[PDB]
Design a protein around this ligand. Structure first.
Ligand SMILES: [Mg+2]
Ligand SMILES: [Mg+2]
Ligand SMILES: [Mg+2]
Ligand SMILES: [Mg+2]
Ligand SMILES: [Mg+2]
Ligand SMILES: [Mg+2]
Ligand SMILES: [Mg+2]
Ligand SMILES: [Mg+2]
Ligand SMILES: [Mg+2]
Ligand SMILES: [Mg+2]
Ligand SMILES: [Mg+2]
Ligand SMILES: [Mg+2]
Ligand SMILES: [Mg+2]
Ligand SMILES: [Mg+2]
Ligand SMILES: [Mg+2]
Ligand SMILES: [Mg+2]
Ligand SMILES: [Mg+2]
Ligand SMILES: [Mg+2]
Ligand SMILES: [Mg+2]
Ligand SMILES: [Mg+2]
Ligand SMILES: [Mg+2]
Ligand SMILES: [Mg+2]
Ligand SMILES: [Mg+2]
Ligand SMILES: [Mg+2]
Ligand SMILES: [Mg+2]
Ligand SMILES: [Mg+2]
Ligand SMILES: [Mg+2]
Ligand SMILES: [Mg+2]
Ligand SMILES: [Mg+2]
Ligand SMILES: [Mg+2]
Ligand SMILES: [Mg+2]
Ligand SMILES: [Mg+2]
Ligand SMILES: [Mg+2]
Ligand SMILES: [Mg+2]
Ligand SMILES: [Mg+2]
Ligand SMILES: [Mg+2]
Ligand SMILES: [Mg+2]
Ligand SMILES: [Mg+2]
Ligand SMILES: [Mg+2]
Ligand SMILES: [Mg+2]
Ligand SMILES: [Mg+2]
Ligand SMILES: [Mg+2]
Ligand SMILES: [Mg+2]
Ligand SMILES: [Mg+2]
Ligand SMILES: [Mg+2]
Ligand SMILES: [Mg+2]
Ligand SMILES: [Mg+2]
Ligand SMILES: [Mg+2]
Ligand SMILES: [Mg+2]
Ligand SMILES: [Mg+2]
Ligand SMILES: [Mg+2]
Ligand SMILES: [Mg+2]
Ligand SMILES: [Mg+2]
Ligand SMILES: [Mg+2]
Ligand SMILES: [Mg+2]
Ligand SMILES: [Mg+2]
Ligand SMILES: [Mg+2]
Ligand SMILES: [Mg+2]
Ligand SMILES: [Mg+2]
Ligand SMILES: [Mg+2]
Ligand SMILES: [Mg+2]
Ligand SMILES: [Mg+2]
Ligand SMILES: [Mg+2]
Ligand SMILES: [Mg+2]
Ligand SMILES: [Mg+2]
Ligand SMILES: [Mg+2]
Ligand SMILES: [Mg+2]
Ligand SMILES: [Mg+2]
Ligand SMILES: [Mg+2]
Ligand SMILES: [Mg+2]
Ligand SMILES: [Mg+2]
Ligand SMILES: [Mg+2]
Ligand SMILES: [Mg+2]
Ligand SMILES: [Mg+2]
Ligand SMILES: [Mg+2]
Lengths: 147, 210
RNA sequence: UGUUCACCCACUAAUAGGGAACGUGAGCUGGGUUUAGACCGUCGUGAGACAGGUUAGUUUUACCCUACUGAUGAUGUGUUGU
RNA sequence: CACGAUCCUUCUGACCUUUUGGGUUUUAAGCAGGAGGUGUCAGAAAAGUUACCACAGGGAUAACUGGCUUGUGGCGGCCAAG
RNA sequence: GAAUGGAUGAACGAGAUUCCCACUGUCCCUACCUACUAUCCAGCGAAACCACAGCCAAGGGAACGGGCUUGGCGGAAUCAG
RNA sequence: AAGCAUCGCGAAGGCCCGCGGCGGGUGUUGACGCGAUGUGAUUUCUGCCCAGUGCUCUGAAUGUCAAAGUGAAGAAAUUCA
RNA sequence: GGAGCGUCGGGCCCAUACCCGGCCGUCGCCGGCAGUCGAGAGUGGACGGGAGCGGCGGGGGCGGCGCGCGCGCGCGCCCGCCCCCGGAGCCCCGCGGACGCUACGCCGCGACGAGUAGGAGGGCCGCUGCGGUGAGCCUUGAAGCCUAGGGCGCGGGCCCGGGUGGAGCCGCCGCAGGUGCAGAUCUUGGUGGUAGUAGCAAAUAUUCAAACGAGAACUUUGAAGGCCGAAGUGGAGAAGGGUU
RNA sequence: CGGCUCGCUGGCGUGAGCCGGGCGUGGAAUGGAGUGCCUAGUGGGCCACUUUUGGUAAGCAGAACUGGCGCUGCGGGAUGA
RNA sequence: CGAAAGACUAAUCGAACCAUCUAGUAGCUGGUUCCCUCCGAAGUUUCCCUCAGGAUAGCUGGCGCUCUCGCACACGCAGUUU
RNA sequence: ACCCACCCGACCCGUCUUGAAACACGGACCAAGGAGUCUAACACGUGCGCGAGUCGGGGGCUCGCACGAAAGCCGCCGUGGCGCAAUGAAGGUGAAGGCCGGCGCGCUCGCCGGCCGAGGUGGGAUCCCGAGGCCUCUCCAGUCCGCCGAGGGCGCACCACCGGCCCGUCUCGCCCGCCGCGCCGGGGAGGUGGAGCACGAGCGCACGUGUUAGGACCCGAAAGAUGGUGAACUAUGCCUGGGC
RNA sequence: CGCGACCUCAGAUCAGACGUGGCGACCCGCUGAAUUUAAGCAUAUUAGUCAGCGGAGGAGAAGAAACUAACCAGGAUUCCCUCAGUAACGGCGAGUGAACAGGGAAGAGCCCAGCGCCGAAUCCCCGCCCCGCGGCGGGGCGCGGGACAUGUGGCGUACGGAAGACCCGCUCCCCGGCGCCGCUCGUGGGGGGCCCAAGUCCUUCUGAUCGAGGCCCAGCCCGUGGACGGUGUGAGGCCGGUAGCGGCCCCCGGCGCGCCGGGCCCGGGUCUUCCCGGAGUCGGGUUGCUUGGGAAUGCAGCCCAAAGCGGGUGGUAAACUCCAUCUAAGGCUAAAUACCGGCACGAGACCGAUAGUCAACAAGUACCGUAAGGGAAAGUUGAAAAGAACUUUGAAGAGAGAGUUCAAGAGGGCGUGAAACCGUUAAGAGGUAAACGGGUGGGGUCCGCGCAGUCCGCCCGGAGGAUUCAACCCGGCGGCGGGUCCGGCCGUGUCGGCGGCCCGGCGGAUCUUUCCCGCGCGGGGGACCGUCCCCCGACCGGCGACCGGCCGCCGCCGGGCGCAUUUCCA
């Protein structure tokens, strides 16, 4: 919508909002990220601390899927399963504890943020945190490694 | 020139890109054309599935996909050999065959034999002439269907086995997972040197004798 | 002497001093400065340099407005002439 | 006051990390601290000439006039030792 | 200052100087004449240039005004210069 | 410009072209010639300077001087000779 | 005998400054109004017993918190009532509520208003096309054009009258953009002043009569006077032209 | 005021940090405050009072301080940043 | 190509002309289209092969939010003074 | 609003500039044309939908498309993107604490049972409780309705401060674990680096402004590069003719 | 010095074939800048991009792993989405920059050399006959030529293959013709032709209407047709079309059946014995280019130069070592993909004659340039030419009358006809260039009046005329509002029915395989939970969600009411 834009309101005025002392010349700074070291340095090193320089190790044929390891927190572990597993449990009276295959739901690691409700579980997962393990045991459950 | 905060960003419009802009005003016209051509091909292969041939079940590669299962390119030779379909014939009954597939584990093999067996059950081979010889099915299962199969033939559905609620034996509860993982990491790490030091120590024991 | 300036001869009453975009190039002239051609000296490895010398080198337009010069006329006095 | 970023090099440091299908060893690559310098000292790697010259501009800036000033030049007082 | 050539030198030069004789309007010092113009007329008929325009003195002013301030003043339309 | 004076070359050569060729120009040529520079008819001269920058001559007597090749140690990349 | 200079009076002169008033806009007000009492607000109302001229017998405070338009009252007759706006008649009305209320509306009080570069808001300002919508307009005259006609708007602009014209065009709500010019030694086209001006001056030269003809300075014929003066203004080619 | 905490400090004590109570206008004048995001133009300046450096001085060059002009009309200063 | 003047090479030569790369780049000239309303600057900072430009502070606008109470019942802030 | 008169006022615009009526440039006049665009990427603001999710592409199913190259639908609804977790160069690791009771010597360390469950200080719009008024036509009783409300509380968001947790790192220390007792693995205390956590705010769509890359507001070089055309002029050589 | 084989080479206007140039949007192979960015510049970038050369096809190229990976593993090529502005490169600056996996579009796989077996079992050309002949083919017959053992053809190629013995089960696939049947998706494939609904109805405007009003239901008639165009304005019905699984005729394709001519004796498993791979290539060194590819991603030249349990890859140089993974140095292959050139169509929130292509027109034209090349301007009378007969002035161009046209105030460069600028006509002014702002005056032009503008409207009082009613009941209709929620429909929250629950379905990682069906899994039942529906009673919000009676009120029509009422008029 040109109708709404600013150039409609600038019609009539000479400079078109670019001033008349200094003008709208083509590329007064240099094109683009020109002068990162010289003559634009201050902007670079007060809004991009650490642009310039190497750091760390190269890694040639990176393939991301090798390092694939999506995490989930205890916080919302019960979310993976239907409420009626968490309900048929705190009930039942066998002391059963329902299984939660986390790898089925698409998380490999189980990290340990959050309060887990006092209600036993069997968490199957590829990897665990230390704390996530501990919390799980404290609920009265069992962590289970899977390949 | 940059002005107070923003991504120091690199656009790739320095070559003559407007010479190679590729618009998509086709796409509707395209989508139709494919669709017509699709419906034509069905009609040509008259009672044969529109899909194509039947294709194997197959697991993806890499740790990432790993858990999922797709359709593969074609059934291996072992899978045809065990099912008892002559490879040259299998092409003629709508069974995809690749021959470059290895077959590592017997769980993936027996599944894919089972597939072909099931296919052969629910297949309606018409006889060559209207006069009916062996193999060719009855005119009952022929009149009741010279019907095409819409969609992929015997589709693969990645499926899960429901685990019932156990009781947690004092042993599961005993397990120290995180520790176990740390241990298992370090033993892979240190396997190799440990073996070299033991090889050193064995040489020192033998060197003591001489 | 391109000179401004300078000096000398002569006359004279006297050979005072200045200004006008250092009056005055669609007024001239173009000798000199100050393109390009060339020579010499000094300087520069060199291309080249030199308020160092030399020689050769295109000086456009007015019919507009004004100003000035002269030329017909103009309003008035009824018209005309004296 | 007496000093120097990124990149690169070099040395020192840990039973350190990586060197990619796995293992051992050399090698290399990282991590951390010093050194090798940028004096145009917040840090290009860099000789002239053009009178054969060009282009973008500048009265932000020279070479005339004209303004301001009058040191300097020119001209004129006052005092009065001579 | 010596083949970055030195010194010379008859002949030659639309080459650079200086003097003398002759000759002359170069000048003292200007004048008269001729032809073609310019001029007036018939016919024909362009261009550059052009903010608006077009009388001065002084003032101030981006420090030399046609326009501003204060004074002088101002009379159609034109011709040749 | 004639005149003078240097310099290179005896042809698998001097000088030069060409993108390339058992290519081409000088050259249908051979030092009284081809090629490269200066000075500039004649006359008369043409001093000294080989430190500098050039050019050139010699070359196991010899400092440095690359790739290959030779040896060396190393498991090898290699390093050193 | 100032229209000079120094010291001082009264008086008068006028800026867009100051004061009062009008009108426009902006800002602010916990602004007001979806329908109610109420102007330093400092209550209103059940309802029960006991009673009545009683009351709440508190500061030269000069007073606000308490008093003289009634509390009980006139009527029905010491007892009853002290009644209902579909009717008190109203300055307040709690029974229902604008002429007003497109709540992006309407209304009230104050204050304030220079502006380049620049920023933002609003434009029932303007251009062209699209979805909607105006039972829109139009040969009984669309667009455009022109107008010493009538008006509106602060303005961008707009609307009507008349003329001209001869086929299409507009209002509103949305969307869209190749959307508004005085300048760019801007581009393309057109037109002036300059101007009936400069100019139609290289190479000696024309004159008389006639013919044709609407018409003769210039054609043609005749006569005269002139020039080129065989290195020609003569007589023939080459190239080039291409029907001259 | 009352009490707790300390791995600090130390003859005992410091000093700090915590809880729990108890007390209200603490000079004049004025004014509603705080706070966060996007952000253009600008980065040639000049002038006056006073102060002030260079300079014989300048409508010269250079600082300070405030206020101007620039961005700004209006009355006065005849004319005028 | 030049008996050398940087001469000449189709009115073009200190590098011809034609088409393209090409809408070449420009810290530099020039221009940059309707109305009202409200707010309204800077020419100073540090850095820059920086000094006719950028960066960065500053100065401007816009959007807000959080609270305050003239609804007899206020805290904080200042180009002052005490 | 057309013309004329008169008094007062009044230099020509545009532009660069500290300064323009300038003896600064551009501009004789009129018409039409004529310059901040579009794409991509980012950021912030705003509007809408859904919300620990969101998403639509790409693909597919529904039609000869009149309107359609639309519209609709999809275990593709989610392959996947962004988001929901960081931190380390990396190997890797990865956001909880409190309290109570018991057992280990409570050793501000190690292990076993119960309860609460995102800490605390100050300020915080707002809610909540509310002594007490303040009247009612009388003396008291007395529920109903307000108005205010001293005093006291829960305290959103947000801010400041102090605690805590996660990753990197250092320093100091003492214990645990077992299929592999090891140059194995795990924890503690105290600092200190992190674009962290501390009951989530994102995703998609749309508009606006700003900043960039692109012809990038419009106009402007001197140059540079590739491939072609010319010696009809002129330069020089050669061939064949002419002339003095 | 003969004749004859072959080998290597010539020549033929020998017989018969092919290749040459073009186009170039897309495609394949080379070649290859510089403007530009970096605020300078040389590496980098621009860019393997423009220009240059080569060669194609309807597509091209690529392609059946010397692949990915490191998994529980995928499995040719191309294309899209994603990966990802990521890993990486880089004066680590500017900047640049992939791949695998994952999801899709599509989907298709094959053949030699070799090693071997088979009397060369093979091929080409001659010549005679039968068919067929506008894509030169079949069949037969020839002591008719030649190619070929320096290797043709069948079997066979790594997914293994061959040959053998017995286990099994049985025998259609192809082409040259000749016919014939069903015209075979935009709903009869492709092409061609020719066809198919309804007003010129009534009035009326007009130069002419396709307009405006009407016409048994917005009017008549068709409507599977109201797209579009044309026709003297604006047309579903005047005409061409448009709609339609509408028609007919041609031709051609494609597929179905029959007959003939040929070819063709074409399997699989099981055990044994044999068989097996492309050299100046890989690989190394190198130099140069190239790449994100980094101690060398790919291509090159030069030098070296292999092997066979080898070789290649396994993204950091090397040695040792295990694993994994392909099988290189020969070849063919549709498809999804591309398409600013061509032929033929369709459309548009585009432009509307200084725009849009250079070009709406006798445009790559005229014109320029030696040449390469450059390159315009330019649309519109009217419905119809009805384009002005004739008279007259003039040598004529030009006029004046006349005429045509609705109009020439449309006259052949003619629709409309702005401005600059000019002519005239009218008015007004005039020595400080004009022009301008503010303020008045004078004159003009028109515009509104008034031949009193005393402007209207309520209510009232009076005097004159005027018809009918208000008021009042009565009968009818319609509307509102109300509570008794009275009676019934209606729906919110709650409770009761466990009643829909199987006569109520979906969802669930809840359960059960006591079930059923199909092969521990899939589908369906069967429990269970969550969610959505029937039955009646009770309480409550009695809600604009409605009905029925009753009430009250209002309004209209019709009755009555004749005149102290009732309106009208002046
Ligand atoms: Mg701006
Ligand atoms: Mg400007
Ligand atoms: Mg700027
Ligand atoms: Mg498919
Ligand atoms: Mg002079
Ligand atoms: Mg003069
Ligand atoms: Mg002159
Ligand atoms: Mg001279
Ligand atoms: Mg000279
Ligand atoms: Mg004259
Ligand atoms: Mg290995
Ligand atoms: Mg010179
Ligand atoms: Mg010079
Ligand atoms: Mg020269
Ligand atoms: Mg100056
Ligand atoms: Mg000398
Ligand atoms: Mg000598
Ligand atoms: Mg000399
Ligand atoms: Mg002037
Ligand atoms: Mg010499
Ligand atoms: Mg020497
Ligand atoms: Mg203002
Ligand atoms: Mg402005
Ligand atoms: Mg018409
Ligand atoms: Mg457009
Ligand atoms: Mg214009
Ligand atoms: Mg004349
Ligand atoms: Mg002749
Ligand atoms: Mg500036
Ligand atoms: Mg300025
Ligand atoms: Mg050049
Ligand atoms: Mg441009
Ligand atoms: Mg600059
Ligand atoms: Mg503001
Ligand atoms: Mg400037
Ligand atoms: Mg200046
Ligand atoms: Mg100006
Ligand atoms: Mg001046
Ligand atoms: Mg200029
Ligand atoms: Mg001019
Ligand atoms: Mg215009
Ligand atoms: Mg947003
Ligand atoms: Mg920004
Ligand atoms: Mg831009
Ligand atoms: Mg240009
Ligand atoms: Mg260059
Ligand atoms: Mg060809
Ligand atoms: Mg550059
Ligand atoms: Mg630049
Ligand atoms: Mg440069
Ligand atoms: Mg490149
Ligand atoms: Mg090309
Ligand atoms: Mg192909
Ligand atoms: Mg291959
Ligand atoms: Mg692949
Ligand atoms: Mg991303
Ligand atoms: Mg690249
Ligand atoms: Mg063979
Ligand atoms: Mg029509
Ligand atoms: Mg029609
Ligand atoms: Mg018809
Ligand atoms: Mg490269
Ligand atoms: Mg490796
Ligand atoms: Mg191929
Ligand atoms: Mg035209
Ligand atoms: Mg036109
Ligand atoms: Mg055109
Ligand atoms: Mg036109
Ligand atoms: Mg026309
Ligand atoms: Mg026209
Ligand atoms: Mg007409
Ligand atoms: Mg007309
Ligand atoms: Mg006309
Ligand atoms: Mg027309
Ligand atoms: Mg007159």
């Amino acid at each position: 919508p040109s109708r709404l834009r600013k150039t409609r309101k600038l019609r009539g005025h000479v400079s078109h909002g670019h001033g008349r002392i200094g003008k709208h010349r083509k590329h007064p700074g240099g094109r683009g990220n020109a002068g990162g070291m010289h003559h634009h340095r201050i902007n670079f090193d007060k809004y991009h601390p650490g642009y310039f320089g190497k750091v760390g190790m190269r890694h040639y044929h990176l393939k991301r899927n090798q390092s694939f390891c999506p995490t989930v927190n205890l916080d919302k572990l019960w979310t993976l399963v239907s409420e009626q597993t968490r309900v048929n449990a705190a009930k039942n009276k066998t002391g059963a504890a329902p299984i939660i295959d986390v790898v089925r739901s698409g998380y490999y690691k189980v990290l340990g943020k959050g309060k887990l409700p006092k209600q036993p579980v069997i968490v199957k997962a590829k990897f665990f945190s230390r704390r996530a393990e501990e919390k799980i045991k404290g609920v009265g459950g069992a962590c289970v490694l899977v390949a | 020139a940059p002005s107070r905060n923003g991504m120091i960003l690199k656009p790739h419009f320095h070559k003559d890109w407007q010479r190679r802009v590729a618009t998509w005003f086709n796409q509707p016209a395209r989508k139709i054309r494919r669709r017509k051509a699709r419906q034509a091909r069905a009609r040509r292969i008259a009672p044969r599935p529109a899909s194509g041939p039947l294709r194997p079940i197959v697991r993806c590669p890499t740790v990432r996909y790993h858990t999922k299962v797709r359709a593969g390119r074609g059934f291996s030779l072992e899978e045809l050999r065990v099912a008892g379909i002559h490879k040259k014939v299998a092409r003629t009954i709508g069974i995809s065959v690749d021959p470059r597939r290895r077959n590592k584990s017997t769980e993936s093999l027996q599944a894919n034999v089972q597939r072909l067996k099931e296919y052969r059950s629910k297949l309606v081979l018409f006889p060559r002439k209207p006069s009916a010889p062996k193999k060719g099915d009855s005119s009952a299962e022929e009149l009741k269907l010279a019907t095409q199969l819409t969609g992929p033939v015997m589709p693969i559905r990645n499926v899960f086995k429901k685990e019932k609620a156990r009781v947690i034996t004092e042993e599961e509860k005993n397990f120290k997972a995180f520790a176990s993982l740390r241990m298992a990491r370090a033993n892979a790490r240190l396997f190799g040197i440990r073996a070299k030091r033991a090889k050193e120590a064995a040489e020192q024991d033998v060197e003591k004798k001489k």
